[PDB]
Amino acid sequence: DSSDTFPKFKNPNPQTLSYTLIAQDAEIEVSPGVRAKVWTYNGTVPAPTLRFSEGDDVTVKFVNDTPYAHTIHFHGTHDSANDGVFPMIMPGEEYTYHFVAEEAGLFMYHCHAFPTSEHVRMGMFGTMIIDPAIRPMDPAREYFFTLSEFDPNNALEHFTEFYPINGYAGQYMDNPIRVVSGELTRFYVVGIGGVLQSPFHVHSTIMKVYPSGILWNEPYYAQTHLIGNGDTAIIEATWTQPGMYLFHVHGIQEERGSMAMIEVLEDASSLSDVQRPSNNKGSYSMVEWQEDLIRTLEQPQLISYENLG
Amino acid sequence: DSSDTFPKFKNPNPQTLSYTLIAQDAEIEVSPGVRAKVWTYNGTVPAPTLRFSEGDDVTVKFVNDTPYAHTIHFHGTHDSANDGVFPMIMPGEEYTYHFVAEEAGLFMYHCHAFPTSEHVRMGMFGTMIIDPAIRPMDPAREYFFTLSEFDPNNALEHFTEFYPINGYAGQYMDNPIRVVSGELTRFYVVGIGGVLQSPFHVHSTIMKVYPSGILWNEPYYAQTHLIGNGDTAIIEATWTQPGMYLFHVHGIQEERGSMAMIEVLEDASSLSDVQRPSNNKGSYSMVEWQEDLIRTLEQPQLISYENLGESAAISSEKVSADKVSIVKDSWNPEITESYDPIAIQVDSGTTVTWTNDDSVVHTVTDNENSFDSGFIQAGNTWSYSFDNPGEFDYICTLHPWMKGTISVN
Amino acid sequence: DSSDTFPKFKNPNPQTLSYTLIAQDAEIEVSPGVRAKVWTYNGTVPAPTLRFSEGDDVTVKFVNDTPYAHTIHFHGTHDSANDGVFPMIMPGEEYTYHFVAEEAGLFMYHCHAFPTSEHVRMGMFGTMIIDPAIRPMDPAREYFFTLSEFDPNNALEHFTEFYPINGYAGQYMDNPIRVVSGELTRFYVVGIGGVLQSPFHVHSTIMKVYPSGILWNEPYYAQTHLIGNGDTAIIEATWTQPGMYLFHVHGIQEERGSMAMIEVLEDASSLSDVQRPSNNKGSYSMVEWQEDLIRTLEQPQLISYENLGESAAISSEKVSADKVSIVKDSWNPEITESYDPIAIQVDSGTTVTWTNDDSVVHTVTDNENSFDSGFIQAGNTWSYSFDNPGEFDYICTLHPWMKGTISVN
């Protein structure tokens, strides 16, 4: 019960929610002037951020529109039929993953077909935010970020050409992450590389971090937080002085597209039409702005197949 | 509470302090018989350890005495003007960083010029200890340790020839870290590589660790503690049996300079002339001994440059074009023409388009300072409409050798 | 009230244990169709899991039956004589480690000969479970897992062909780890690679983790827990739905042997004859099942040696010089001239200087104990004035095949 933990809590008002994710091969821009073949859910890398509340009855209809077998493996608690290792979902097929959201927190989903590292390297990963039932997280402006490894010439290169934040290298340099002076900000960060780990660092302020994205834990304070591959972190920070700052993975990643600008604004008024009310009651989601920008920059061109069997 | 945490506290007796740090090129010994070129603050790698108290008012005079652009980026809380990204400090120029120490803990500082891995790999990093104001840390013998990656032959090698502790590979094997039986010992450890992480391990005892060097946290007990690059850790331990022991990063680093010997003495008597009273009241700092040894072993040979900031005039013949390439490998000074065409002519009203054909960010910045691209990402373009006749000399603010001209008719 | 921890506690009924570990060379299968040369304790990789209680009196008789120098370094609290650095144990010699188990937790033991990375890559590592004396951990089905790096063609390769769990790559894909629906399960996980770190991930449930394997700590909840090399983690989990699941290191490791099937059973009845009553009272240990399977799959062919006595350096010629090189790559026994010149002649009163021209630490040590350099770091020198006529056979205590002679007249 420490004032900063969120214990497991049976949702008094659960909802039944549904998503449809389609495995789709595509050509996307991953960096200025660099087009690459990817394997995706719904045409972008990262895949759509899924978001619901602890206790909700979640259904994800997965459709395989590629010539290869695929699955979706969600992090979190569920049974074997919903764990995305068996069965393989064959071309043309549909499989309904179904589970009650058992734990709040920050999770990920990604393909688990052999070889899993290759499928993740090709783009088949996304974010799953499960908001707590006992009470909302503190009112905040919310962004999500995946930290990944991408090489357009050799998908399994040990040291990849790019280490993008949200798939497109360097996008938040030309389109800064906007925060408001004195306003709480919350970052949902997903570590989904395969070789190096990710020391996540934010300039000019101290992070409040929930280890592993699990809200049962007492948070701790960090200048840098190491996020292992396959792990997440929910991070809160406040910037009090307007101006431009940075955040990035701390290492060679930041020379290869793991770099973002933070613009601290004195007032929120330019964000009124961009933000959406959050599933955390009282918070402001910028996730939709982020996903619009990802699609705008990646300019996906699907590879549409005819057989599928 | 804790009883082991140090909450944020208003210092009733803050002091005002100042430092001068000079970006200086040098040749240093980094291993026995291995002399290498480095980029430093004040002539050693690591740079000087800065130490003061939470709530102190700190001013750092930064002077750039090299032909590269440089900054100082301090970890911890401060504002944008003092964050070491904006502006780049040009050769021969100076900058004043100023901040009130907002929180206690262990931090670091390092150059944030681009590419940042190159500047850190060449040596521009140091340690920043900020002592808690609510009460002093428990009385202890205190040492600091940077964990870095260094290669004398290729600065940016993924796997470096050396993984030194405090800059000089293996120095604490011949010069052990001395501790006293039964006396609390505190290590201030900074992780500042770019590729591998650092499992910090000490032999024969269990570590008490403040995660991320932040004293607000409850500490935890560890046999090994993973320090990410750009992270720190405050570590306390006691040895109770005299003899020799080791500590090291656990991995291939330990064969490449990341190993140190610990000498547990029966009492503190042989240390009374080498230790110094710590800024943590009641503690015993060995940092001065360490930094004296770093300088003795490195034997730095400072490099001094004449006419910093001066460069020849562009005399290339003007080309009628509205498209300019920022040339591949421009982040290497050996590329003598960094824009192509280096000198262009356009009519009034013409939009010119720069394409960054390098793999490093660059800018296009008027020094009469009528236009400024900001960061241009690798592969991206930046465009500007020139509606006023005259000649405009422009530079990259990240790489001072990089210059061009545009004549508008 | 922090009732999730196990405080340090003076065991009122300590037991006295004596173990015997023998350094033995072997060939083992490390993956289907792949045989490789390894260095072991007692013939398998990993070495035998040692398990006892906090406060127990532990003796480990160590016998080196190989032509390399070896030690056992134990993680946890002990004194210098039992730290496994000093002394090296020479071929055919023996050493008795002895310590009282000073704290509970999950530890590790491995060779600390030099270069340590090579001895750990070659297979000289094991697990050490020290159960708490204050109270047993919660009743659970118990497994242990080492996470290592192994390459059968180049032991020191940065990126290895395999990342096995418990030595044999992929063994738990065909031999699932069996757990029981609703029954607490406890994994004792040891990280013992040298290059990459290990994010340890279990499917379909959230783990409770004791960081660093230290039971004094409050545990925390994780979907993935990063285990640094040289670190451990005690992990607890409960699956509630029967069927097949997975765990693995999250990374490229998972396609190279670091993957395991989990079979959740409806009840424990089918495990009644393989499980054993655990040293944690009330728990069920599966460790014996695991180590039987490791040996069955590895099929070790051991190499015994009976005559490992030192003998003297073999040379065709003697040089009248007072400078000797410790040759590059002499830590590889294939390099047959380890010192150059191997055999030297000097007059009484001559000071001989050795230079370490290798990249690894070496020593110069008389077979009697007239003189000894200790560690000579790469690129450093060590000298000794021979004032009395005589004949001297010296070696490197780190690398027993390195031998030379000094004739003083």
Ligand SMILES: [Cu+2]
């Ligand atoms: Cu797939």
Ligand SMILES: [Cu+2]
């Ligand atoms: Cu920073």
Ligand SMILES: [Cu+2]
């Ligand atoms: Cu995963």
Ligand SMILES: [Cu+2]
């Ligand atoms: Cu930065």
Ligand SMILES: [Cu+2]
């Ligand atoms: Cu610099």
Ligand SMILES: [Cu+2]
């Ligand atoms: Cu150790």
Ligand SMILES: [Cu+2]
């Ligand atoms: Cu930094």
Ligand SMILES: [Cu+2]
């Ligand atoms: Cu060691």
Ligand SMILES: [Cu+2]
């Ligand atoms: Cu530039």
Ligand SMILES: [Cu+2]
């Ligand atoms: Cu060995």
Ligand SMILES: [Cu+2]
């Ligand atoms: Cu998973």
Ligand SMILES: [Cu+2]
């Ligand atoms: Cu170790």
Ligand SMILES: [Cu+2]
């Ligand atoms: Cu998995």
Ligand SMILES: [Cu+2]
């Ligand atoms: Cu040797």
